[PDB]
Amino acid sequence: DILTGSTASAIEKLFNSPSASLGARVSGHNESILNSFVSQYIPP
Amino acid sequence: AIPVHPTPASVRLFEILQGKYAYVQGQTIYANLRNPGVFSRQVFTHLFKRAISHCTYDDVLHDWNKFEACIQKRWASRFRESTFESWSTTMKLTVRDLLTTNIYRVLHSRSVLSYERYVDWICATGMVPAVKKPITQELHSKIKSLRDRCVCRELGHERTIRSIGTELYEATKEIIESLNSTFIPQFTEVTIEYLPRSDEYVAYYCGRRIRLHVLFPPAIFAGTVTFDSPVQRLYQNIFMCYRTLEHAKICQLLNTAPLKAIVGDILTGSTASAIEKLFNSPSASLGARVSGHNESILNSFVSQYIPPSREMTKDLTELWESELFNTFKLTPVVRLYVRYSSDTISILLGPFTYLVAELSPVELVTDVYATLGIVEIIDELYRSSRLAIYIEDLGRK
């Protein structure tokens, strides 16, 4: 369906998906963050 | 007691051969060994060999003596020599035209036996079911019609042609019984079962136990069934390739909004109305949310990672070509052309001609006869014939 679709309904499907925004958490219920970095490493 | 064939594992494994998941450029070589092809060639060269070699030498002796007496009453060693050569050439043309037109109408005729369906079982399962079909009554009339076509070819006036055509009627009779006696079911409608006690394999073609040859036995290692045929091995690489093409199209549709945000007719158009259509579209601005109704964001980053897709299918195509060449030992013409070569005739036509199709009095192909024209077979089968020595024996007066 995605590989063969109308590409207007297919974009309208994916833009409400839960697979469109990563939400990550690091906490111990009192512990604070100090810095954040992002990397796109893909192994060979 | 354990199901084998109609499972979501195996029927998924059959549709890869039809082309449904990751059809790439290497898989097209698999259709180079599903033609009728060589099997029409070996039925041809068997009926040509039997119809020629059964003839005698003494009938040719008085036939040329009938010929030279007809030329002695018309028009002396040079005179006999040009008449002898003409006679031999005319005889070769008549024998060539007296077989190859009779042999095609029985070749391209409908046969319940299909070499195309036998390959689809050898690949991807390793075992072949067969069904007995006794006879059907219209083929008896098709035996009579070629027999009514046989005496119509007897209308010519020569001694050897009556003796050649009689066995050719008999030789095409015994082949056409066997080429319509065994029917092979498609890939559905039959189940193959494994009872563990005295472990054999049983087929059920609509509630009837039929014959089933096993060529490479599947290994049943106590939880599942794994086959030996060279599609079971490529089963893991194909789905590892196909689930990225389904994943790259996911990554290519999330990176289609020209601007992204944290929230806390087209192919042939006027191109002014087309831009005016898309600029009010809901597909022009991504709005993504991450909240638990009290939870706050701290940072935001954006990346345009698109996974490799043209790299996976290049490798998959090379792997498919290598797997096909090695297991069945096909030899390319250098690619330019992909042919059969003799180790493939023993491994594919071997268990077909002798084991499932009950064809006893038939030789296999020679690897030069497998792919070299059709008229290139006929002249060499005339040169290697037992008749051509009898003709060249007449060269010494």
Added chain:
Amino acid sequence: AIPVHPTPASVRLFEILQGKYAYVQGQTIYANLRNPGVFSRQVFTHLFKRAISHCTYDDVLHDWNKFEACIQKRWASRFRESTFESWSTTMKLTVRDLLTTNIYRVLHSRSVLSYERYVDWICATGMVPAVKKPITQELHSKIKSLRDRCVCRELGHERTIRSIGTELYEATKEIIESLNSTFIPQFTEVTIEYLPRSDEYVAYYCGRRIRLHVLFPPAIFAGTVTFDSPVQRLYQNIFMCYRTLEHAKICQLLNTAPLKAIVGDILTGSTASAIEKLFNSPSASLGARVSGHNESILNSFVSQYIPPSREMTKDLTELWESELFNTFKLTPVVRLYVRYSSDTISILLGPFTYLVAELSPVELVTDVYATLGIVEIIDELYRSSRLAIYIEDLGRK
């Protein structure tokens, strides 16, 4: 009981051959096997072979004896030799001009039988319907007119030409009945149906059950119908390619505003009025909104990702060429030129000449006769003729 052909799955599969979705450079090779082409060649070489070889030798004997007596009254071994050679050359020219002009007017003549429509069923479905057409009365006059054209060619004064032209009238008679007796419907207006009980295939050409040959049976795996022909396999790759060309034009029209924003005649013009037109246009500034009437934005990023489109169609073209070459075994001239070669004649012209077109007394083509000129056929069919031996027999006095 289950519909097969008039479905949105199959009629979508037919328009790919017409060229409607992803027509790329590889698909143009498919039109290299839809010409009338070889079928006009085998009708030609059958009527040339029948009209030559039926002639005798004794008629040529007194015809040259009629010739040399006409040259003995005018102008002695060297004298006979130059007259013999001239006679033979004149005879060859007359026989060549007495066939090839009569054989073209019956070749390019309208035939209800089209080899072009039979290929469009073999590809993309695998099965061919046929309709019986008994006769039409203007063709009886077209039989009489070529018969009135036959005795007009009898106006020449030679013995062999009256005997050659009589069978040529008869040989073109039996062909022209069969080349107008079977009509093939286009791709619409017929439905093909599958009843499951005693499962055969039935065609309905406007409420009448007609003949239908099945060459590769489609596998009906309990939910859908999948065909075997080499367009069903490429059905998934073409739409995976075509839905990115429709998607790249979406990405190329959102990245056309020179400035983007978060909101909380042209081809031949004066180029000063053209800039003055576009600078007031609504197609010069993208305004995108993301709100739920209380919801606030937190970040904004911009990316110019355009998906690969020239990479998909390069691969699709290579895949199409490979699929066409392997399934039908065409051999290129090295590309420079793409030809038929003998394994394609058995797989395409085989079930046409003998199975759907009721053409019994006809041989297939030789692979050197398939694509080698037209005059290159005629001289070799004269050299391999049964008449040329009778001429060379006269060389020895």
